[PDB]
A paper describes a structure:
The impenetrable nature of the outer membrane is due to the presence of a large, amphipathic glycolipid called lipopolysaccharide (LPS) in its outer leaflet. Assembly of the outer membrane requires transport of LPS across a protein bridge that spans from the cytoplasmic membrane to the cell surface. The inhibitors accomplish this by recognizing a composite binding site made up of both the Lpt transporter and its LPS substrate.
We first solved a structure of LptB2FG in the presence of LPS and compound 1 to 3.0 Å resolution. Unexpectedly, compound 1 was found to form extensive contacts with both LptB2FG and a bound LPS molecule, which is a unique mode of inhibition. Because LptB2FG was heterologously expressed in Escherichia coli, the structure we obtained contained copurified E. coli LPS. The drug pose observed in the ternary structures of A. baylyi LptB2FG in complex with E. coli LPS fully explained the resistance mutations that were isolated in Acinetobacter, indicating that contacts with LptFG are critical for drug recognition.
Numbering used by the authors:
A (entry chain G): 4 to 137, 145 to 210, 218 to 355
B (entry chain B): 10 to 247
C (entry chain A): 10 to 248
D (entry chain F): 2 to 176, 185 to 195, 204 to 216, 223 to 235, 247 to 350
Write the structure that this text describes.
Amino acid sequence: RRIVAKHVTKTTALAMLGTTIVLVILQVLFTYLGELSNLKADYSAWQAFLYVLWGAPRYLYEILPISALIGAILGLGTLASNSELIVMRSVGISLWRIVGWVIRSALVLVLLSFALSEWVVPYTNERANSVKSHEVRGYWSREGQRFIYVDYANSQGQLKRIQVVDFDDNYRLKSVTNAEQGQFVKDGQWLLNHSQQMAILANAAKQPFSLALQPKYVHMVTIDPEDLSFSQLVSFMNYMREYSQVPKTYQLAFWKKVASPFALITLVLVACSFIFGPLRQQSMGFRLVIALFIGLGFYYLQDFLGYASLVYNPSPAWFVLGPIVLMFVAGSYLLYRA
Amino acid sequence: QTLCIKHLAKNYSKRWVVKDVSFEMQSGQIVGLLGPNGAGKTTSFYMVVGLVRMDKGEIHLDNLDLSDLAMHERARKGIGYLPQEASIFRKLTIAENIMAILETRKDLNKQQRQQRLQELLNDFKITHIKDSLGMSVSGGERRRAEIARALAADPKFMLLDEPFAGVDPISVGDIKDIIRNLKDRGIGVLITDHNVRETLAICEHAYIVSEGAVIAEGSPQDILENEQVRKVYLGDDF
Amino acid sequence: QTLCIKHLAKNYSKRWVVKDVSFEMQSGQIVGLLGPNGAGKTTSFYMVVGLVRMDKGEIHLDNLDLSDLAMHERARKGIGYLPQEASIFRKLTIAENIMAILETRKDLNKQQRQQRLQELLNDFKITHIKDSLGMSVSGGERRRAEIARALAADPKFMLLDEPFAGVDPISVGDIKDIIRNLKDRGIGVLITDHNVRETLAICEHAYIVSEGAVIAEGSPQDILENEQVRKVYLGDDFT
Amino acid sequence: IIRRYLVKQVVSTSLVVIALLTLIMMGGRLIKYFGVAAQGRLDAGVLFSIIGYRMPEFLTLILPLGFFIGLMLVFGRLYVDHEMAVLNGSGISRIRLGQLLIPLALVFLVIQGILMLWMTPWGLRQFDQLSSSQAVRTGFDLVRPKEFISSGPYTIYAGDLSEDRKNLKDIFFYQDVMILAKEATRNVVDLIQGRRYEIYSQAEFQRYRLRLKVEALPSSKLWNKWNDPVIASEMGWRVFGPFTIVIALMMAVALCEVSPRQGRYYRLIPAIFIFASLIVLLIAIRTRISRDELGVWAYPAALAVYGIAAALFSRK
Ligand SMILES: CN1C(=O)[C@H](CCCCN)NC(=O)[C@H](CCCN)NCc2cccnc2Sc2c(Cl)ccc(-c3ccc(N)nc3)c2CNC(=O)[C@@H]1Cc1c[nH]c2ccccc12
Ligand SMILES: CCCCCCCCCCCCO[C@@H]1O[C@H](CO)[C@@H](O[C@H]2O[C@H](CO)[C@@H](O)[C@H](O)[C@H]2O)[C@H](O)[C@H]1O
């Protein structure tokens, strides 16, 4: 079967893309209103429009889960209200096959979500921040049993006022070394000057020693764990895990990204099951209203359970994959009830 | 082929709308499922199709239990459904509507699918609109394309829902000719309709269901001369 | 009183659904506005009620133009509407359904409003079910409450939309008595209905609206003998 | 009977919408507040008091929005299930039905007049004192597990943290005095099995104790002093603000006509944006007067333009 599949996929795809265009345009206009109250002498209305316009790919990335939900509601709602889903079942097309055709439309949004996350959002985020405001300072890091503090760190391999403190398995001091400038030449060693090193008293004009800081991840320190792309996040987590402990705010960000495609498909399946179930024979406006309540309910639930994973002992995987598994099970049950 | 249906039952808001509705239908035979409005003729009809889940009952088709099957699992066994409302694929052409369901057939290859599509269009005289969108055709022309589309799935029992709905007396003969054509094609037809004057004119064996149960059975001649049907449904004069 | 309708017209999506429809209905006379489905009999009926805005023509009630008046302004002139679908106030008591419209009347005080409600309930044999909600009644009893409610507004012309819709042959005769009673009440009745066989059995003057224009006019006997109607609407075999 | 029928319907569905918007508008803020509390920047035990003190602030917006939405759902239902064809067909127009709800809108105007004039400042006054009390948190209060927190001259690293923000584990403290402890219970912090270093003085120990708006002013004080544009914008926002209920009445009557097949909720999203364009205009008017660019007379003018536009559209 191909003609039926194209009709169901194209109708839903145009509804998922049509909702995406509308939702991004509304969020750009709404964000611009909030950004219009921060104008000043050096930040004009045009400067505040580019900062919001450059943020559109990031608003786009966060709309795809809710535009796919509304898209499947409106895409299949048009088919359902026209009695087109009844005559697909009347010839032998199952409910799970019609859901599979809608998932094909959502798989375009999942691939679009990957492209924005990996290559588009991390770039326009850099451009957006440069529009408004126009290397990490006071960087505190731990490397196993050593605590390293650098006042100024640069992505090109420059340091200012380094301070490294060594400890034992019994937590006893060995050396508190301080420098004035530092340079990066190879992994696991940095060249530096004026090595005023304590010993449990010593000095050196120029000597390198071992430290695991790398300039590649310096620019990722200030970036929030949520904002980091998956390529940046996993590489950064692998770097921290090799020398220290990864914070739970990075574990949550990792799980909130690996479960992003699975929350888009699951939320589509819930939309399809509602069309065949509770939202059958309802008005198009009522389906859109309910599709907005599920979107907010899912956004609030994933926001709250994200925060709850940073305050409670269990791993963030339980809180992130919790609703996704339950909505899939509950959504697949509403499909079993036909 | 015989579609045995035994002891149907269904409740809504803790009220049994259908109570022990049982009737038998054979292939190549028109059977009218009639009765007072809201007395269970529509609900008993939908439980045969599969829209309404069966609380109690047994549906058999050639020693083959369709009771547990869903709407689509029955449709693959040879049960068709023609909705009363407009059910044409709006954005697909009339030829694409029939071709959409013809590709579902497994025992047809691409060579004979086009031949089957051509004769289905010629049978119902919708060739002149084969390239027009399903949303831009006349109600009489669209309904012929919905029946032609339903016949693309090769059904053994076509369950028509309200065929004489909004049909003028001039074109009531056209619908009867279509329904008579389905019988001559070897397809049993189950008709539920509010228009009982014309449904009792093509059906060979009618079932009158009142108060949720079958109160009469037989040919339209026997239905008319039935005291319970005359008292409850048809009235003294008819 | 004579409701006069002249040269109705209405175009939908640049297609003239109604083209020069004109008919006259008097008080105490039942007029059936019939015709092929989708030929403009439904749209022409709505322009008389006021649901759809007129696009050409005029409506008169004893040299009192009603074309420019909205639906509610014609109702105060004595024109009623009975929707085919369930139009009862769902969460109001049946006694309150009739009473909600009786309190609208200005020429009735509390003393004679309860008297009118009591006789309206008795005239339609719903006084036994007068304490139940509008949405918790039988289909036959609900319509009797919608006609009692309509009479509470004291109309001079009642425009019935599909009175014989979803009605069993046992209960078709019950509606015939209701419509006959409305005529016996001095109220003209305009009926549009797909069930032409039963609509022609009560109306004394039927109008057949085909291709957007009135093609027939007169008693049901004259409509049946019309060769133009039997070619487009009724067919060769009809009685 | 027809007025009591409508008031019961509008009040019932407006309270549902108001309770539905309160759960959504402040459920989102409560979750956001919980996000701040999860990072130690706000006490987890007071974030329910913040929601209590922001009830009048959000209900200032929800009440006109709940009344507007509840009005169109009721008037949409009358159109959808043909109760308006028999009300118009009996001589009662839609404008007449909206005029039967003026006594109800006056009650909602009085209710919101209480919110805008009294509880919105009172709620914001207590919230401002409370929020400023949470901005002084520093030191071990802002600590996070497996992370370095710097607050002034203090740098604190904790290897683990309980579900409550007590009983720290693997504590590192830096000024220059460096303190490392295995356990710490909480500024007053009791350190257990720790080492103290001075940067060269070393002192091991078993236990250690470480000791490291015009929007809320009362309306009484704002009744006078109309000369100042900042007070002029705020006091005008409190006096002409409650009259959005009346505008939400005659604009919900205008934008409620909907077909039975279209649905009760068909005209919600298109018409919530028409209502929201009024509020966005009124927020854009409150700021200009605050900079002394527009004048206080523009509050009724914004309402009158929407009032006249709604009245003209309902009578077309
Ligand atoms: C800067 N403002 C605030 O501080 C209010 C105060 C919150 C309620 C306090 N009780 N918060 C916010 O903006 C937070 C984000 C800020 C995070 N700190 N969320 C958004 C928001 C909420 C509430 C109202 N509008 C808005 S967004 C807005 C809108 Cl919808 C429409 C127009 C404008 C605007 C006006 C003039 C101008 N040239 N460009 C733009 C804005 C910008 N917003 C503003 O101008 C307002 C002005 C204002 C001060 N007191 C008010 C009391 C009621 C209504 C408005 C105000
Ligand atoms: C259903 C909707 C009906 C129509 C509603 C139209 C109005 C919608 C509300 C507009 C809300 C504006 O939302 C507002 O977005 C701005 C972004 O500029 C956020 O602003 C926040 O982040 C920006 C940059 O990210 C900072 O410059 C700013 O200082 C900070 O407050 C506000 O915290 C938020 O309140």
